[PDB]
């Protein structure tokens, strides 16, 4: 019903940095929280990060708290994920998604709803 | 949904309330989108407060003034010896009395011109008249060099309260108002005191508004707010020479000394064509409540005393009582004679009399007519409307009809998915 | 941005972002003095009522009193997105005192529990 | 539910459950304005004094001031279970200014310690 | 203790330790009493709009702009007095207060969301 388009990056060496982004269309971006979810090529889904609708609150898994930064721009309808100190274990398809937490005055969700088309991160 | 009570402070809500407003003078306004507010100008406590404030300020202004105790004597009144027009014969008398002076034992003979309406005959052998109010109350002279001109006054809400203003066009004083705004102070309202005609005030923006409570009840006054002002020229064409005497230590009395030239009647000039069009506008906006085929008649203000049967107003500092017989005589230039009165009992009080000192020269006022106070006869195919007034709340309801005072209730609760711990 | 009461006709979710605008306008011869004393008393009564709920110094104060479905059987997508604070204030004119009593009792229990936990070595 | 001061003759441990009943009755021509202004001034002096101690917004405020056995040598089983607040006030009134000074100094030291703790990067 | 305003001529880092002496003299003819109460309540309201409700020393999340004052802390707190400092930043005080209000508003919503997580 809505369109989410990710922009990925190329091949990065261990210890380098890589920026992913996601553009939203077809709904009010500022009304929903957004998240990034990781999927290794041979494994299942793993949640990595969650940001609220205003961009003020960010949550991460312990393994990325000192490495990944999630940022939101409600005027450009743009998400970004800046990853530092990448390792070969971080090679995966990353998806941006609409869902997760709701901002206290909205009905409770705690689920992912709309998904993008994926972006590949390859680490040497 | 496992909802919890969350307390919010600073909630933009209000409740109807009656509080004390404070006054301001010249030594914001926020439009409320999607806000519909119910107004009722007939239950608006701003009118009662304005009434009490104007009476209180009036009493405070007149209190520290000359009490004119020496004037309750016997007056030797004779006919004025000047050239008097046909309609002024007997309306002005040349009255001689023995007035006191600074020294308690010395008295001076003083000649002054009193209007017939200010004196009452009596049957003493040596004196003919007395002042009308000496059997009822003491007569306080208004302090000289004090103006009675209405000065725009702003009513301002206390902190925690706000005034809502109705911006709707063709607003009839009651019911929902969709275009509203929040103000802290009202516009500048002139405390004009008059009967039958509203002279200086807010003018309607689109059409003549017929504004009344229970319009089917003929006992209620109908306030007509015009969208065009009719210009009325008020003149007292008598070149009045004013004299002054002292009647005690620190006291002074002012009186009419003479009239230079011929004595003529005071007049008001209302344009015939403009008033005829104004009445046509009132009738077109009045048939809506009585029927398109109902005959609407205007008749004079029969019944009551001079204060309510004539158009009373303060022009210059003289109180005019104009016979509006030529403005309200019709079935659907006008010169109105006016009587001038100096012993004034304002509002509905009996025991509080004021003496208006005369003003040197010729008084001319140019005033608007922005609205009317009409009443309707009781009891088929015709209706009779007459000038009304004298209550003096209508003169201020016609300005405060668009304002309401509300109390702000900043505290409230609402469900949220938010648990404190 | 909209000024005092400018959000009164907006939805309560949008009007909740103007709480400081409303709060700043609550504080600012015998009639002037009586009006000022009355404004101070209304402000202090509201501040005391917040204080006894554990909400002192806050404009948005979450509590631990559950919402009873009998007070208003509406979802948050309707209360916060399609309703104004004026309509809500009219809707819960009834039950406001019940909510206030429950908030006072909950804060008394919370103060006793905090006193017992802080006194626990 | 005993009413205003209904717990005045109850023990301190039982009377401490009615703090909101007494608290809510503290706020509610020139003679009456003087009375209202004095009521407001007494309330504000008490609230400022609580704020200085770091007790703002609470009816039961725990502090870091040790109790001096010279102020009162009674144990908790006597003060809270077999004594009323009036008798306690009569016993402690000689020492309440020392206690107030110690509370003010303790809160000033606590504020400096909190500011220094929040200055560690 | 020096007394009321006795630290007015002392440096900011010395006068800041006597805040309770100043605070106790703000509350203690009717027009004067009501005016004093209103000024006290306006100051406490400004503190409550910010997150500084019950505190005399309150740390906020507003960064200091070098355009307001570019002095280092070794001059503001050790050399300068509160009167000179108050004169220096008068022109920006109304800006700073506005930012403080904005910060608290964001904080309140963030806290409301953080307490909304099950
Ligand atoms: C309705 O409004 C009109 C317009 O203001 C009022 O007429 C004005 O009345 C004042 C009364 O003080 C006049 O001021 C006087 O003017 C004379 C001029 O010689 C001066 O000698 C006096 O000392 C005083 O300043 C003012 O001129 C007059 N304006 C016009 C254009 O004539 C009218 O009185 C108001 N109606 C009522 C019922 O109050
Ligand atoms: C109202 O209109 C009448 C016209 O009927 C004015 O009367 C004229 O006044 C001038 C003034 O000197 C005289 O010269 C004319 O002779 C008068 N005409 C008549 C027919 O008597 C009257 O003055 C006007 N009044 C005002 C206040 O404007
Ligand atoms: C002056 O006003 C009166 C009414 O206020 C007008 O009507 C006169 O009223 C008296 C008593 O009610 C009657 O005796 C008169 O016969 C009435 N006059 C007429 C012409 O019928 C009076 O007409 C007004 N004066 C003018 C000059 O119009
Ligand atoms: C009033 O009567 C006295 C009698 O001496 C006279 O001098 C005076 O001119 C008279 N006034 C008028 C207006 O005729
Ligand atoms: C005075 O004027 C009145 C007016 O009607 C008249 O009746 C009366 O006779 C006059 N008096 C004298 C003495 O001319
Ligand atoms: C004063 O005298 C007049 C004479 O007509 C009379 O109408 C009026 O009632 C009297 N007033 C009092 C209070 O006696
Ligand atoms: C409300 O009244 C004002 C008065 O000028 C006008 O400008 C505005 O357009 C009106 N709004 C509506 C919605 O009618
Ligand atoms: C009277 O009406 C005229 C319109 O002809 C207007 O310009 C003037 O300001 C009005 N005066 C008052 C006092 O309402
Ligand atoms: C006043 O209202 C009438 C209604 O018939 C209208 O014809 C006239 O143009 C209006 N005048 C103004 C100035 O709005
Ligand atoms: C005024 O307007 C309200 C709007 O509903 C209407 O009910 C009432 O009858 C009107 N009254 C008059 C006198 O026009
Ligand atoms: C006016 O008042 C009378 C008094 O009985 C009542 O019968 C009538 O219904 C009222 N009309 C309106 C429109 O309020
Ligand atoms: C009235 O008469 C006096 C006498 O000198 C004169 O100065 C004045 O101008 C006259 N006034 C009028 C309005 O005719
Ligand atoms: C008198 O009234 C007429 C109405 O036709 C008006 O044109 C004229 O200007 C008025 N006179 C004055 C002096 O304003
Ligand atoms: C009033 O309602 C309209 C309906 O879309 C909305 O756009 C507007 O923002 C509302 N007004 C306010 C002040 O929120
Ligand atoms: C909600 O209120 C009703 C009142 O009829 C009461 O019976 C019910 O127990 C209340 N619910 C809770 C959870 O307290
Ligand atoms: C909220 O409740 C109303 C009540 O009928 C319902 O129509 C609406 O769909 C509900 N919203 C959600 C998001 O469930
Ligand atoms: C509140 O309760 C009373 C009890 O009779 C009832 O009449 C009134 O309509 C109720 N109000 C609401 C808004 O439910
Ligand atoms: C008064 O004392 C008796 C003694 O047993 C006790 O039971 C009672 O509860 C006391 N009253 C109050 C109000 O505490
Ligand atoms: C408080 O106790 C200490 C010993 O702990 C003692 O030195 C001091 O004098 C006591 N305070 C008073 C006021 O007696
Ligand atoms: C403790 O309290 C009991 C009474 O409950 C008393 O008899 C005893 O002496 C107290 N002990 C102390 C102060 O050490
Ligand atoms: C203390 O305990 C005794 C035990 O008999 C009782 O009589 C007395 O009333 C109690 N005192 C208070 C203040 O409750
Ligand atoms: C408090 O001090 C006064 C001063 O002498 C003394 O008389 C009184 O007994 C003291 N109170 C107590 C409870 O010791
Ligand atoms: C005034 O300046 C001197 C110079 O160092 C300083 O020692 C003294 O403490 C200052 N006074 C105050 C009240 O701080
Ligand atoms: C300081 O203020 C200037 C004023 O325009 C602004 O441009 C700048 O970004 C501000 N810097 C900070 C760090 O707030
Ligand atoms: C602060 O800046 C001044 C510039 O006048 C400089 O002299 C001083 O050394 C600086 N402070 C520190 C601690 O470096
Ligand atoms: C800073 O310290 C120096 C020490 O010499 C002094 O001269 C200067 O006035 C101080 N600055 C201020 C603003 O007082
Ligand atoms: C502050 O404003 C005053 C006048 O308002 C001006 O004289 C002064 O230079 C300004 N200071 C700064 C630092 O902008």
Numbering used by the authors:
A (entry chain K): 1 to 52, 52A, 53 to 82, 82A, 82B, 82C, 83 to 100, 100A, ...
B (entry chain A): 32 to 58, 82 to 141, 150 to 309, 311 to 395, 413 to 459, 463 to 504
C (entry chain B), D (entry chain E): 519 to 546, 572 to 664
E (entry chain F): 519 to 546, 575 to 664
The study reports:
We found that adjuvanted protein or mRNA-LNP immunization of rhesus macaques with ApexGT6, an Env trimer engineered to bind Apex bnAb precursors, consistently induced Apex bnAb-related precursors with long HCDR3s bearing bnAb-like sequence motifs. Cryo-electron microscopy revealed that elicited Apex bnAb-related HCDR3s possessed structures combining elements of several prototype Apex bnAbs. The primary hurdle to eliciting Apex bnAbs is believed to be the low frequency of bnAb-precursor B cells possessing a long (≥ 24 amino acid [aa]) and acidic HCDR3 that can penetrate the glycan shield and bind to the positively charged surface within the Apex epitopic region. We designed a slightly improved germline-targeting trimer, ApexGT6, with affinity for additional PCT64- and PG9-class precursors, and we evaluated B cell responses to this trimer delivered as an adjuvanted soluble protein or mRNA-encoded membrane-anchored protein in RMs.
The structure of RM038 in complex with ApexGT6 also showed a 1:1 stoichiometry and a tilted angle of approach relative to the 3-fold axis. However, the HCDR3 of RM038 was less extended towards the 3-fold axis than PCT64 LMCA. Overall, the HCDR3 of RM038 exhibited hybrid features of PCT64 and PG9 when interacting with the apex epitope of ApexGT6. Cryo-EM revealed that some of the elicited Apex bnAb-related HCDR3s possessed combined elements from two Apex bnAbs, PG9 and PCT64, when interacting with the trimer immunogen. Our findings suggest that ApexGT6 could potentially induce hybrid responses with the high precursor frequency of PCT64 and the high neutralization potency of PG9. This hybrid HCDR3 structure has been observed in humans, implying that these findings might be relevant to human immunization. In the cryo-EM structures, we observed a dependency on the engineered V2b loop, where several germline targeting mutations are located.
